[PDB]
Structure formats: C-alpha cells, structure tokens
Symmetry: C2
Subunit: 222 residues, 2 copies
C-alpha cells in the first residue's frame, strides 16, 4: 500500500518539544487531522492540508482509513503523546484491524512532560517513589494510589480519600503556552485555590509537591 497513517504526538506546548521524527512526519504528511487545541507553532510546521477535529471519534478513524486507502500518507496530530488517553489506542487498533499501515510517533506528555519542563519532579528521595496519572472525567470511580498523583483536567472530597487535607497540591494551567499559570497550596485550599484558573490544567498532589516553591522559578537570564 502507498497509504499510511502516522499517529503523532505534538508534545505539551511549543514546537521546540516536538521530536525529530514528529517534525519529519509533519513535513511529509499530505493531510493532518489535528486536535483543535494544538499549539499554533506546531500546526505551522505542517506542510500538508490541516483538518481540525466535539468531533465523533468514529468520523476521525473512518477518515484516516479512507485517506490511506486512497493511497495518501496522513497524520493524526494529538496533544501530548498520541497513546496517552485521547483514544489513541482505539485508533491504532482500528488501523490494524482495517489492514492499514501505521506508525506511532511518541510525544512529550501533557502531564509528565509539562512538569519536567518546569523543572518539577514527580518523585524524590523521602517524598515519593511512585506516581500515577488519571483524568477527572469519571468522578464516580476511585482514584489510583501512588505517592504522587497527577490529574489531567467534589474534587477536594475525592482527593481526601487518597491524601490528607494538609498535603501539598499544585495546579498548573497552560504550561508552555501564553497565559501559563501555576498555583501552589494544599488539598484543603480547594476548591477556592482553583476557581479562576485557565484551561486546560494539570493537578499534582503529594509530599513531593512541597519542593515546588523552591523549584518553580525559572532562569531569569540576569
């Protein structure tokens, strides 16, 4: 087949965090079905037809398959890593089952990657040896258990079922984007500490967050 689909990660922010392979794919891809919230600088590097994609997943998947069968090289461009949440695994399965050649191009994740960009650790001797990542879409279901919990996008209540009210908590919105905002406090400070924060945002809770005040500042170049 001439057709091929690349599931591409755009990273958490600007194009400087794109991987070299991701860059190549965005140059050669004839058509790119990209998430609406993909950084402008990343989209600007795509030299094919940009197609923004709430759009039903069935439509996205069918179109990727249709395009490849037409003999085109196309890309699905997604924030962060293409396989972390965001139905990437379902897209991969569908392509495999349809007999469509495809490759997955890793990206710096929306969670872990953003925190590292700010020089913030998820683990640290004596504070945390493990971390878990989850989303806030199913408030009725239990949260995972790890020394450090990262939540993408009754909140205080549920966190209390995993951490004491005094546990350090960080809220990081639009990291790497204009309007980036970070708030440091404790679980008990919620919901107040949140309300007013831009979107989308990340939440990190656990003893390791206690180091964020000293590590958050960036090099000022002075």
């Amino acid at each position: 087949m001439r057709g091929k689909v690349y599931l591409v990660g755009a990273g958490f922010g600007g194009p400087e965090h794109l991987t070299l392979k991701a860059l190549r794919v965005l140059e050669v891809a004839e058509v790119v079905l990209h998430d609406r919230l993909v950084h402008p600088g990343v989209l600007a590097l795509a030299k094919g037809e940009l197609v923004p994609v709430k759009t039903p997943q069935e439509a996205i998947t069918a179109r990727l398959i249709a395009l490849a069968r037409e003999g085109r090289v196309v890309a699905r461009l997604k924030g962060g890593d293409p396989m972390v949440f965001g139905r990437g695994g379902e897209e991969a399965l569908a392509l495999r089952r349809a007999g469509i050649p495809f490759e997955v191009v890793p990206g710096v994740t929306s969670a872990v990657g953003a925190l590292s960009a700010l020089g913030l650790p998820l683990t640290h001797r004596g504070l945390a040896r493990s971390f878990a990542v989850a989303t806030g879409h199913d408030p009725a279901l239990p949260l995972p258990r790890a020394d450090t919990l990262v939540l993408l996008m009754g909140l205080k209540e549920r966190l209390l079922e995993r951490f004491p009210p005094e546990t350090p908590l960080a809220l990081l919105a639009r990291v790497g984007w204009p309007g980036e905002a970070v708030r440091l406090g404790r679980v008990e400070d919620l919901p107040g500490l949140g309300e007013g924060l831009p979107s989308p945002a990340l939440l990190v809770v656990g003893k390791v967050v206690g180091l964020y005040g000293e590590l958050l500042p960036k090099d000022h170049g002075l």
Copy 2:
C-alpha cells in the same frame, strides 16, 4: 553566560530527541552524559562528551562557574526516576542558572513507539509508574502499572504484583526498545519470572487489562 541544561535524551535513537534537546546538544560546550546514552544521540553533541551523583553535581556547578554552558544528558526524561530533582535543587540552592529540557520517557515513550497504549476507555483509565529494584516495597495501584526494573527482581515483584492483579492478568516485558537487541515478551502475571528468561537489559514491565491488546497491536 554560565548555565546548566538538564537534558533528556529520549528512550532510544535520535529520532525521538526533541528539537530543543537537539539545540542544546549543538550549543553545549561540555556534556556530562550517562555512559549508556544512545550513540546516535551522543553523535549529535558538538561539545566535548564527558561520560559519567554527588561528584556529578559538583562538576556541573564547577563548569557553570567557569562561565561554561554545560549539559547533563540523561536517557529518557531528566526529571523522571533519577536524581533530576536532586540536581535541580542543588543547582538552584547554588544559584546556578539552569533549564530542564524534557525527553520522551521509556515508561510511556517506548510503549508508544511500538504502538502500545497504557490507557483505553474500556480497559484502563489510570496508570502508575515505579521502579522494580526493591521488591519488598508495596506497589502503587492503577489500572495499568509500568515498572522500570532489573530483571533479577522479577521473582520478588511477582509477589507484589499478585497483591495488585489476578494471576491471569496480561503482562509484558519490553527490553531495549528502540535499540539493537529490542525484545518483547507477552504473557500473564503467573508466567513470572520465567517469562523474562534470557531477556537483555535494560527492560520494563507493563501489566494490566490493556496489555491484552498488545499481541494484536504488534506486528506479526
């Protein structure tokens, strides 16, 4: 002008290096890199490659104070499961200018590169990452668990894993992904430790219902 960059090299070849890491490798004067960083990545360093904790840090600071731009090159991401936090704290407390450059982790990146997900709306809505160096320690709890570990602790980890997952739970061992010698083993928790017999290092373990999809997702 003296500054330190904590740079992630990604889990494998230069193809997974970020643009920013590429720039740091082209600009840095000295590069203190983990002795095992992919050669394809080290090849991109234009400064002097210095194969290489307490001492490491002291040297970073030392070099910076000489007014040099140095890079601490680590496999994967600079802040994930290393001493990145310790290094950053040290640099900051020493008043040294520094920037952290993220890289694709092996924990997520290596799986993604193979077209393997840690999440799926029907099979896994959370994942956790930890090391498997100390099997006496309880493991985190998530739908999908990823452990970075020495293959010699598989026997002990099996005990901790059965305390988190039914014995029939799909489990995968992925070694040297993205490197020559890449090898993948698919089985179930009950297959440990034999499932990893003869596997090369470094390797990671992934376990959970989502792992049941790996056989179909991987090429024949």
